Amino acid sequence: GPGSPNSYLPAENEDPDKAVVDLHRSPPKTKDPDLTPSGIIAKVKAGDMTQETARELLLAMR
Amino acid sequence: GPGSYMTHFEDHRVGSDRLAADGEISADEALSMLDAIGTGQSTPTGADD
């Protein structure tokens, strides 16, 4: 779980006994588990996805 | 021969004989299609680079 920047200063910081373990949480999912290969090529033609990520998804569906 | 070495620029995508399919595609065929995608002069506009 990624912390604060290395240049941070601990003014009014939390307790030194490692209290309040509820930080570092990831954002909600924004992906679909199944697509058509036509849909992959359409995303790239629309500029909405890189060729790199598109190829990666197609290698998982072939 | 030695050609451009690692120095001089080259526009490597000279083109072959692949064109856009009129229908559905395999996920294998789609890998080959990604290399041919581009814009440039593909649609008329007043915009410029």
CB B29 within 8 A of CB B21: yes
Of the candidates B30, B35, B37, which has its C-beta nearest A37's C-beta? Answer: B30
The tokens for A47 are 């500029």
Minimum distance, in Å, between the CA of residue A35 and any CA atom of chain B: 10
User: How would DSSP label each residue in B2-16?
Assistant: -TTTTTS--------
Of the candidates B25, B28, B31, which has its C-beta nearest A38's C-beta? Answer: B25
Query: Which residues does chain A have within 8 Å of residue B38's beta carbon, measured at their own beta carbons?
Result: none
Contacting residues for B34 by C-beta, under 8 A, at least 6 apart: A41, A44, A51, A54, A55, A58
Experimental method: NMR
Domain residue extents for chain A: 32-62
Distance, CA of B42 to CA of B39 (rounded, Å): 5
Distance, CA of B47 to CA of B49 (rounded, Å): 7
CB A44 within 8 A of CB B34: yes
